[PDB]
Amino acid sequence: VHFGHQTRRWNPKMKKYIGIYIIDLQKTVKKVDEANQRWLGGLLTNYKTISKRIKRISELKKEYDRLIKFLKERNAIAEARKLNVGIVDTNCDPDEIDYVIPAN
Amino acid sequence: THIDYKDTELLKRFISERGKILPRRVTGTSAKYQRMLTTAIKRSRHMALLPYVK
Amino acid sequence: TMTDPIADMLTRVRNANMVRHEKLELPASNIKKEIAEILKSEGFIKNVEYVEDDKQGVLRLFLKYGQNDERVITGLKRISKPGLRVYAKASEMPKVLNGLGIALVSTSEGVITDKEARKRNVGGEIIAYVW
Amino acid sequence: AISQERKNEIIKEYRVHETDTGSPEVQIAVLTAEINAVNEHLRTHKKDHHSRRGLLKMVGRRRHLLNYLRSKDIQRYRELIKSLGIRR
Amino acid sequence: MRTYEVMYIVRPNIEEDAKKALVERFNGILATEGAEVLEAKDWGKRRLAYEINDFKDGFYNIVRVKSDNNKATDEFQRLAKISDDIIRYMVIRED
RNA sequence: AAACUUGAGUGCAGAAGAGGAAAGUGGAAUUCCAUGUGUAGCGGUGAAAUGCGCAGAGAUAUGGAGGAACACCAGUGGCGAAGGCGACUUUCUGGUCUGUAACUGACGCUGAUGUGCGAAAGCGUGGGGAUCAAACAGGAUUAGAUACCCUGGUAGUCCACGCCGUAAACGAUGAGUGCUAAGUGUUAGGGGGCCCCUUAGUGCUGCAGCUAACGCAUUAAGCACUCCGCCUGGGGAGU
RNA sequence: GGAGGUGACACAUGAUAUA
RNA sequence: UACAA
Ligand SMILES: [Mg+2]
Ligand SMILES: [Mg+2]
Ligand SMILES: [Mg+2]
Ligand SMILES: [Mg+2]
Ligand SMILES: [Mg+2]
Ligand SMILES: [Mg+2]
Ligand SMILES: [Mg+2]
Ligand SMILES: [Mg+2]
Ligand SMILES: [Mg+2]
Ligand SMILES: [Mg+2]
Ligand SMILES: [Mg+2]
Ligand SMILES: [Mg+2]
Ligand SMILES: [Mg+2]
C-alpha cells in the first residue's frame, strides 16, 4: 500500500510524501493517526434537490433500480472544498486535502 | 567509425530495390549516422559503385 | 547585463515568497547583507546565513510563513533605481502601508528603516519598501 | 583564416609574460592577423557578405580592447600601436 | 598537411600494355610539387552500376596523396578532363 | 587609488552544421533536332473548340544540343542577425556549441545620429533562353466575361556587374541580465553507473502568475533592473 | 480524441427611418 | 406604420 504511480506522471507536490515512486510508509503511519458508484453532481451542494430524490427513493421500479445503485472524485472535493481526510496518491493533489494520507 | 563510400556492400543495405536511400525511421539508424550514410551513397553513385535508379 | 543587484535580491525574495519556498540563496554584497539583517530584525524573514566562497560570498535567507501558511512578506518594491535615484529628507520620510510596512533607507549612519531615520533625524536614499 | 602554428608565433611575440594568452596585447595582435587574413579573402571574394560580417565583429572587438588598453596604461598602448600597422 | 584519396576509372577496351603508360604517368602527375604518393592501388574490372560513355566496366584506380598545396591534384583533374582514357574521377580530402 | 574573478574576452581539448564566396563533376526529367519502326489521330475540357497531324503527327527506340533545377535522403531536423541556405568535389572563409580553468582582470549592456546587409517584383549594361509565364492573340463560358478554363506566347524567370531598399521582411512578440512547479519528444555534446545526472538548441503539454478574452507559461505574454524604437479615436492619409 | 506539417456547366439583384 | 418609386 506504498507503491505509487509511475514517475512520468507523479505530481511535484508529493515529493515529501515520495522506476516508479514508493510512498512514505513511515510518514503515513504518523498521518493515519491524525486522520462505489458514480458521484452525482451536486450531491452535497444541491441537497435541496437530491434529498427529494432521496425521499422519493424511500417512497417506479425502473427509477428505483438506478436510484438504489446511485443513492476520480474531483466532483466531490469541489462540493466540499467550496464548503470550507482521504488517501492521496502521488498523482493526486495534496494541497486540497485537510487530512492527507500519503499511502498508495 | 566513419562510413566509406568504397564499401558498397555496407551501403547496399541502406538503399531500396529502386536504388533510393532508405529513410532512417525504416532502417533504425541514428540521425548523425544517416547523414554520413547519405554522403557516402551519393559519393558512391558518382563513382558508379552504386546505381542512381535501377 | 545585471544592472541592479539590489532589485535582483528583492525580486528573488518576491519570487521565492510567491511559491512559498523555505529558503533561497543569492550572491552576497555588503548592502544585501545589511538589507537582509533588517528584514530579520523587523520580523519579515526568519534567518540570514553568510556562506564564504572564493568569488563574492553567498547569502542564505529563510522565509517566514504564519499560521495557515500565510506569507509574512506581502510585497517588495524597489524605490531608488539606477535610471532614477530617489532621495528623501528626515522631514519627508515616507511611511509604508500607514506604518504597517517599512522603508529601507541608506543614510550616512548606515542602512536603517524609515521609523529609525526619523528618530535619528537623517535622510538618504530610499532603497525599497517592504510590507 | 590563420593556423594554430601562426597563432602561437604571434602569442609568443606579444605576450607580456610567460604563460600569458589573455592580455590585450596578445588578443589585439592575434585579432590583427585574423583581420588582415579575412581582408585578403575578401579581396577576391567581394560578394562574401557573411564572412565580412565576422570581420566587422573582429574589428569591433579589437577596437574595444585597444580602448581598454589605452585608458589603463597609455605607454603599453602606444608601444603596441607602432608594433602592428595600426593607427589609433 | 593534407591527405587526398584520388580515384579514377579507365575505359575497359584499352590495350593492356598501354594502361601502364598512363597509370605510371597519372601517378607521376599526382606526385609533382611536393606530393609524395602515400599509396597506389589497382582495382580490377568492375561492373559499373550504370553505363558511362556507353561503357559497362572500368579499371578502378586509387591513389593516396600527401601534399600541402593541392596544385598536384589540380593538375590531375585538369589532365583527366581532356583525356579520353579516363572516364570518371573524384578527389577526396581524407583528412 | 588598490585588490578580485563570478560578467566579458583569450588559450587549450573535442564536436556538429542546406552558414557564405569561387571553380569543377554528375544522374533523372522538360523542350528542340536527327534517324529507324510504324499509322490515323494526338492534345485538351464540365462539355468543347482553338492548335498540331497523312508533306507521316502523337507513340516507340537510339543519338545529339541546350538551359534550368537537384527525386530518394528529408525529420515542429540542421545552419544563419535577418533576408535566407538542400546533388556531389575541391579551394578560400564566418559563426555557434561542449569540456577545461592557462591567461587578462569589468575590458560589459544598449544604442539617437551613422554605416551596412536585405525575399520577390522592377531598372541599366551585357550574355543566355530549356521550362514556366504578366502583357498579348486565338478558343471557350456568360445577359455581358477586358476573368476564372483551354491552345499559344513576349518581358521576365537564369548568369555577371551596378541600382532599387520594399513585403502578412510574422513568433504580427526589440536587445541584455537574473529569478520562478512539473511531464514528455527531438538535435549537438559532456559526466557516471541501456539507464541516471548535466550543458546548449528545438517542439508539445501543463502549475503559480499574468490576460479583456483568446491564450502565454524556464524558448513568458510571469516576477524584476538597464538601454533603444514606437502609440495616443476613425476617415482625410502614409495623402 | 485533440493539435501542428503534407498532399487533394451555370446561380445577378433586392430603396429610408422605424423592428 | 410613415415614407420613397
Ligand atoms: Mg577547437
Ligand atoms: Mg560548433
Ligand atoms: Mg549593441
Ligand atoms: Mg537607427
Ligand atoms: Mg529578381
Ligand atoms: Mg495561359
Ligand atoms: Mg534581366
Ligand atoms: Mg544582383
Ligand atoms: Mg510592425
Ligand atoms: Mg525581454
Ligand atoms: Mg527573461
Ligand atoms: Mg501552455
Ligand atoms: Mg529546453
Swiss-Prot record, chain B:
Q: Which UniProt keywords apply?
A: Ribonucleoprotein, Ribosomal protein, RNA-binding, rRNA-binding
Give yes or no: UniProt keyword NADP.
no
Which GO-annotated molecular functions does the record name? small ribosomal subunit rRNA binding; structural constituent of ribosome
An example Gene Ontology cellular component term from the record? cytosolic small ribosomal subunit
Q: Does the keyword Cytoplasm apply?
A: no
Gene Ontology BP term (one): translation
Question: Which domain of life does this protein belong to?
Answer: Bacteria
Tell me the protein family, please.
Belongs to the bacterial ribosomal protein bS18 family.
Q: What does this protein do?
A: Binds as a heterodimer with protein bS6 to the central domain of the 16S rRNA, where it helps stabilize the platform of the 30S subunit.
Q: Give the quaternary structure.
A: Part of the 30S ribosomal subunit. Forms a tight heterodimer with protein bS6.
Q: Could you tell me what this protein is called?
A: Small ribosomal subunit protein bS18
Please name the source species.
Staphylococcus aureus (strain USA300)
Whole protein: which stretch is covered? 24 to 77 of 80
Curated annotation (Swiss-Prot), chain C:
Task: Answer whether the UniProt record assigns the keyword rRNA-binding to this protein.
Answer: yes
Query: What is any one of the record's Gene Ontology cellular component terms?
Result: ribonucleoprotein complex
PANTHER family for this protein? 40S RIBOSOMAL PROTEIN S15A
Q: What is the lineage of its organism?
A: Bacteria, Bacillati, Bacillota, Bacilli, Bacillales
Example GO molecular function = structural constituent of ribosome
The protein's matches in SUPFAM superfamilies, at most eight in alphabetical order, are given as: Ribosomal protein S8
Q: Which domain of life is it from?
A: Bacteria
Report what the protein is called: Small ribosomal subunit protein uS8
Q: Source species, please? A: Staphylococcus aureus (strain USA300)
* Family, similarity comment: Belongs to the universal ribosomal protein uS8 family.
The protein's UniProt keywords, in alphabetical order, are:
Ribonucleoprotein, Ribosomal protein, RNA-binding, rRNA-binding
List, alphabetically, the PROSITE patterns matched.
RIBOSOMAL_S8
Q: Which HAMAP family match?
A: Ribosomal_uS8_B
Which biological processes are named by the entry's GO terms?
translation
Indicate the secretion signal residues: none
Q: What does this protein do?
A: One of the primary rRNA binding proteins, it binds directly to 16S rRNA central domain where it helps coordinate assembly of the platform of the 30S subunit.
Question: Pfam family example for this protein?
Answer: Ribosomal_S8
Q: How does it assemble?
A: Part of the 30S ribosomal subunit. Contacts proteins S5 and S12.
From Swiss-Prot, chain D:
Highest taxon, organism lineage: Bacteria
What processes does the entry annotate via GO biological process terms? translation
Fetch the SUPFAM superfamilies from UniProt. Answer: S15/NS1 RNA-binding domain (SSF47060)
- Which cysteines does the record link by disulfide bonds? none
Which Gene Ontology terms cover its molecular function?
Answer: rRNA binding; structural constituent of ribosome
Entry keywords, A to Z? Ribonucleoprotein, Ribosomal protein, RNA-binding, rRNA-binding
Cellular component (GO) terms are: cytosolic small ribosomal subunit
Q: What does this protein do?
A: One of the primary rRNA binding proteins, it binds directly to 16S rRNA where it helps nucleate assembly of the platform of the 30S subunit by binding and bridging several RNA helices of the 16S rRNA. Forms an intersubunit bridge (bridge B4) with the 23S rRNA of the 50S subunit in the ribosome.
Assembly and interaction partners:
Part of the 30S ribosomal subunit. Forms a bridge to the 50S subunit in the 70S ribosome, contacting the 23S rRNA.
- So what family is this one in? Belongs to the universal ribosomal protein uS15 family.
What is this protein's name? Small ribosomal subunit protein uS15
Query: Its gene?
Result: rpsO
UniProtKB/Swiss-Prot annotation, chain E:
Concerning InterPro entries, the annotation shows: Ribosomal_bS6, Ribosomal_bS6_CS, Ribosomal_bS6_sf, Ribosomal_S6_plastid/chlpt, Transl_elong_EF1B/ribsomal_bS6
Could you tell me one molecular function GO term of this UniProt entry?
A: structural constituent of ribosome
Q: Does RNA-binding appear among the keywords?
A: yes
Q: Name one GO biological process term.
A: translation
State which residue ranges cross the membrane: none
For this UniProt record, the keywords arranged alphabetically read as follows:
Ribonucleoprotein, Ribosomal protein, RNA-binding, rRNA-binding
Its cellular-component GO annotations read: cytoplasm; ribonucleoprotein complex; ribosome
Kindly indicate whether the keyword rRNA-binding belongs to this entry: yes
- What role does it play? Binds together with bS18 to 16S ribosomal RNA.
Similarity comment: family membership = Belongs to the bacterial ribosomal protein bS6 family.
Protein name listed in UniProt: Small ribosomal subunit protein bS6
